[PDB]
């Protein structure tokens, strides 16, 4: 099961980005869709399922791509995007 079941709802994850510092650069809508919530500290986000944390987001970064790059064993990522998608990033 998920590491943090309480953030399993995409709407709750989206609400967490109310003070996100990079709205133009990396859309909260995409981050929330990809399983991430904002920790509230700088640009640090975390996946509700694997609990993997990412920071130092750059212009044009794609949340799903970064999810697969750094946490390829996440079961939320696998269920959502499939194995072909993960393998292609690696």
């Amino acid at each position: 099961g998920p590491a943090f079941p309480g953030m399993g709802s995409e709407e709750l994850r989206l609400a967490s980005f109310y003070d996100w510092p990079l709205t133009a650069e990396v859309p909260p809508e995409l981050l929330a869709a990809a399983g991430f919530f904002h920790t509230g500290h700088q640009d640090k986000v975390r996946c509700f399922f694997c609990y993997g944390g990412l920071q130092s987001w750059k212009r044009g970064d794609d949340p799903w791509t970064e999810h697969a790059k750094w946490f390829p064993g996440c079961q939320f990522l696998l269920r959502s995007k499939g194995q072909e998608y993960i393998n292609n990033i690696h």
Binding site: K44, G52, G53, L54, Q55, S56, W57, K58, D61, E66, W70
Partner: peptide
């Protein structure tokens, strides 16, 4: 991005 990079891991925390």
């Amino acid at each position: 991005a990079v891991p925390i």
